[PDB]
Design a protein around this ligand. Structure first.
Ligand SMILES: O=C1c2ccccc2C(=O)N1CCOC(=S)Nc1ccc(Br)cc1
Lengths: 548, 401
């Protein structure tokens, strides 16, 4: 059929006109085929013969279909497409199974020849003209009355065309849920066997009245379902079967696929690490390379293969109930979390490593995760969940308040999952009585990569190490470090370069940078550290001296 | 009758911006707030033949429980630029800032009278999203002057003038500025009479509608930069002193940090007051309680706003066009960082709007994703300034402490 729905006024881009592309001769039966196919599409109205007036044309070739032994008509619109317009994005975001309310009866319907069932715009059909060659360059040409297969607006228009064609019936049945993913209709209702199947023959008729055919009465499909990698029951949901066939040798490829499969399972499977598997993917590797499986990995894979053993399942959503979300510290930059409403029946799982930033301390890392989860909960359940965290209301307060940046967590409770998050050290608000004053300094020749990091003291002391390949931005994190070893437990330090101050000034508790690292333990060891800054190269007691 | 042949900037297409994910209550509100609007003929759905899109949010009036819909034409405005600015833009009275008090009036529901240049309606396309993307999402378009749009005032302008004639005529001292959706009116009339005159003004509007917000710019004066007074003085205290003076020195042509800076030593060790360094603080203190000499406002360059957080619900903000050329510097004081800043910003903006007739570029000391998640909740203004997130330099925060 061809839907009687209204049409969408298509249009070309401004300074542009139709497509005109030489149609290069085809092979014997390819022609035969294309003629056969075309005859049918015309026999229905999908196409219709145009005179030689139509200036426009796009190439058209056939192709043998693997199934049985049939050809298929195939028309690249690359041109007509480059010259067409832009459309309301068809792609915007897929639902997440966890966001779904729970339904009693459910059935999917697939759409016949969707595209070739929606009537293209009349005043545009001229731009779709294509030619069936003669065994050797008399000619014969057609036009489109419906949406061409590889066109471009086809997707948009269809989506639009269907929302409306579906509009009324929906009004008629407010309680029903219909979801449209391509040649597919997902229909859900809390009504049972009896009035659901009837409820369908209804929709079926409605769809027909509007020209769309569907699978037969006893000729449809039932859950579990497959969809974007999910398996969908009317009460629960999970990721699709994930297998790990045993193997001794893994190509770079092998494990990429592995890591991939694994990152996906984590939506619902709690406790899936892939950190020691990402290590292995370090360096300009060449896919085909075989990689040994550093202990860690192996161990993992198992505990992974284990957790997988048991099939798991997320639940669906209850608008009335709250959203509980509780994070856990899983080890050095890694965070896992579950979201649920009741006992411990998760709606979804998930993890977080997004460890961008140079230097970072748990607190932040932890907060960052809240944010992450916040946004995520918002789009799926249209609301923010209550949080339970491995941090003392106090250890937080202390932080957020002293910290320069702005923050704000929604509502949350303290949990006692015992990798608790803490501040591993505090700087000193004011100076320190009876403490070696350390005027530290890092230098360097801008064009040789050699400087010298030393320090003086109100106590006469004096020192200076020989630095190899270091930038001011490293020799400075050495003028300090030094002053950390040669001083007791309670020191006064003084550096130039806000840089050093900046980083330290921010109680960081681990950095992608061995040096900083060091200067971290040093602090976690001390008992009183005051860090002070002064106008670099000026006439200042202390800083001046060290300046040699 | 017929509309202003709105014409975009050749060499640029419409705006196409993704829709923010919105909470259930905001979605509800918008869908209802929008059903009527079309009913009212102020808007109407649109086919997929429209690639364009603009973000939109829901806000609450003055803490009141009624939802106002807020469209973010931030982008579109840039695209229209020359039109609303170098075309029909409204000039700015340096008089405003001077008045003893200014009321701000929301007079934007007026636009919904004048019709939008049909051929320009497509650009105003927006979209109401849906929970978990389970259904496509209603898509609309304006067939009238949209609000948060800078194109509206420039057009409605002519009308507005006329509407105001009589009134202005009867008090050639009231100064009415107009910046997006709101009307700024100032007078040196003692409050009672002001409030009166404003209410009286209100009345004119009513009919053309085919006290309040008390703001007193007169009592604004740049937040000075303070140097402690002490009485003891130690390396640390004096060490910081210059450090600051170092910054000051930077700007404020005249700052002198020598006798002081010239005075090894042990940190916690206290010292005296320099025979004749006293004149340092004395002299310096002076020029600091002063407006940066040498700094003037360039209309051709746009304004830039910087805010740092100083514990205790306190916030310090500077306004400039050229780093270290401050035009303005003040401060501002259910307790959450996000809310307070959101307020500070609005506060700053307003002032800015009252002083220069344009909104500044904000540098927000906060994670994008977070601001980019909550700002709406405590946002009330009918405009949205430009912002850009950053990381506060250490000493800075201090130098303005
Ligand atoms: O039927 C579907 C879908 C099927 C696949 C993907 C997305 C949806 C969807 O939003 N809808 C409409 C809402 O469905 C709802 S609220 N609940 C459901 C629907 C379908 C199943 Br198998 C389980 C639970």
């Amino acid at each position: 059929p061809i839907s009687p729905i209204e049409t969408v006024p298509v249009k070309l881009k401004p300074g542009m006109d139709g497509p005109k592309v030489k149609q290069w001769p085809l092979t014997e039966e390819k022609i035969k085929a294309l003629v056969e196919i075309c005859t049918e599409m015309e026999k229905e109205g999908k196409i219709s013969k145009i005179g030689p007036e139509n200036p426009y044309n796009t190439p058209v070739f056939a192709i043998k279909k693997k199934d049985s032994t049939k050809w298929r008509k195939l028309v690249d619109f690359r041109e007509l497409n480059k010259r067409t317009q832009d459309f309301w994005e068809v792609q915007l975001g897929i639902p997440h199974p966890a966001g779904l309310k729970k339904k009693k009866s459910v059935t999917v319907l697939d759409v016949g020849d969707a595209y070739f069932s929606v009537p293209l715009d009349e005043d545009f059909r001229k731009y779709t003209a294509f030619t069936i060659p003669s065994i050797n360059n008399p000619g014969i040409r057609y036009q489109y009355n419906v949406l061409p297969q590889g066109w471009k607006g086809s997707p948009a228009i269809f989506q639009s065309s269907m929302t409306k064609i579906l509009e009324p019936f929906k009004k008629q049945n407010p309680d029903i849920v219909i979801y449209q993913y391509m040649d597919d209709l997902y229909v859900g209702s809390d009504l049972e066997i009896g009035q659901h199947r009837t409820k369908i023959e209804e929709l079926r008729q409605h769809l027909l009245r509007w020209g769309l055919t569907t699978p037969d009465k006893k000729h449809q499909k039932e859950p579990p379902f497959l969809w974007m990698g999910y398996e969908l029951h009317p009460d629960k949901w999970t990721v699709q079967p994930i297998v790990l066939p045993e193997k001794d040798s893994w190509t770079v490829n092998d494990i990429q696929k592995l890591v991939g499969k694994l990152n996906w399972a984590s939506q619902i499977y709690p406790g899936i690490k892939v950190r020691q598997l990402c290590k292995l993917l370090r360096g300009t590797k060449a896919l085909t390379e075989v990689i040994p499986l550093t202990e860690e990995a192996e161990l993992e894979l198992a505990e992974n293969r284990e957790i997988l053993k048991e099939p798991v399942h997320g639940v669906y959503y209850d608008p009335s109930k709250d959203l509980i979300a509780e994070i856990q510290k899983q080890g050095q930059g890694q965070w896992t979390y579950q979201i649920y409403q009741e006992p411990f029946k998760n709606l979804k799982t998930g993890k977080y490593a997004r460890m961008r930033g140079a230097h970072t301390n748990d607190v932040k890392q932890l907060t960052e995760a809240v944010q992450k989860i916040t946004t995520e909960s918002i789009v799926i359940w249209g609301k923010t969940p209550k949080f339970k965290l491995p941090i003392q209301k106090e250890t937080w307060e202390t932080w957020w308040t002293e910290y320069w940046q702005a923050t704000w967590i929604p509502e949350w409770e303290f949990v006692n999952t015992p990798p608790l998050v803490k501040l591993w050290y505090q700087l000193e608000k004011e100076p320190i009585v009876g403490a070696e004053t350390f005027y530290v300094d890092g230098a360097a020749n801008r064009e040789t990569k050699l400087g010298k990091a030393g320090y003086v003291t109100n106590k006469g002391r004096q020192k200076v190490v020989p630095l190899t390949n270091t930038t001011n931005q490293k020799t400075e994190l050495q003028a300090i470090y030094l002053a950390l070893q040669d001083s007791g437990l309670e020191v006064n330090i003084v550096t130039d370069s806000q840089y050093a101050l900046g980083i330290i000034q921010a109680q960081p508790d681990k950095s992608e940078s061995e040096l900083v690292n060091q200067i971290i333990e040093q602090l976690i060891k001390k008992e009183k550290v005051y860090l002070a800054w002064v106008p670099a190269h000026k006439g200042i007691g202390g800083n001046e001296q060290v300046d040699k | 009758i017929e509309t202003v042949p709105v014409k975009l900037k050749p060499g640029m297409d419409g705006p196409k911006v993704k829709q923010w994910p919105l909470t259930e209550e905001k979605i509800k509100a918008l869908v209802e707030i929008c059903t009527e609007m079309e009913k009212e003929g102020k808007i109407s759905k649109i086919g997929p033949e429209n690639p364009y899109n603009t973000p939109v949010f829901a806000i609450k009036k003055k803490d009141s429980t009624k939802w106002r819909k807020l469209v973010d034409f931030r982008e579109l405005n840039k695209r229209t630029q020359d039109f609303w600015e170098v075309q029909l833009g409204i000039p700015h009275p340096a008089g405003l800032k001077k008045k003893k008090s200014v009321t701000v009036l929301d007079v934007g529901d007026a636009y919904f009278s004048v019709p939008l240049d049909e051929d320009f309606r497509k650009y105003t396309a927006f979209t109401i999203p849906s929970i978990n993307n389970e259904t496509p999402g209603i898509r609309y378009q304006y067939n009238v002057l949209p609000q948060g749009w800078k194109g509206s005032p420039a057009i409605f302008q002519s009308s507005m003038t006329k509407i105001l004639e009589p009134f202005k005529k009867q008090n050639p001292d009231i100064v009415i500025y107009q910046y997006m959706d709101d009307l700024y009116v100032g007078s040196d009339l003692e409050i009672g009479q002001h409030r009166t005159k404003i209410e009286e003004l209100r009345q004119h509007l009513l009919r053309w509608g085919l006290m309040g917000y008390e703001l007193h710019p007169d009592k604004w004066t740049v937040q000075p930069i303070v140097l402690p007074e002490k009485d003891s003085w130690t390396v640390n205290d004096i060490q910081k002193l210059v450090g600051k003076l170092n910054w000051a020195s930077q700007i404020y042509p005249g700052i002198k940090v020598r006798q002081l800076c010239k005075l090894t030593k042990a940190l916690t060790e206290v010292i005296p007051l320099t025979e004749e360094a006293e004149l340092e603080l004395a002299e310096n203190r002076e020029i600091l309680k002063e407006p940066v000499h040498g700094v003037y406002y360039d209309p051709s360059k746009d304004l830039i706003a910087e805010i740092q957080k100083q514990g205790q619900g306190q916030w310090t903000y500077q306004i400039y066009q050229e780093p270290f050329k401050n035009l303005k510097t003040g401060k501002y004081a259910h307790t959450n960082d996000v809310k307070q800043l959101t307020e500070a910003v609005q506060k700053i903006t307003t002032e800015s709007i009252v002083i220069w007739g344009k909104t500044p570029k904000f540098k927000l000391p906060i994670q994008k994703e977070t601001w980019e998640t909550w700002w709406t909740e405590y946002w009330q203004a009918t405009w949205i300034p430009e912002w850009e997130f950053v990381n506060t330099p250490p000493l800075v925060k201090l130098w303005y402490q």
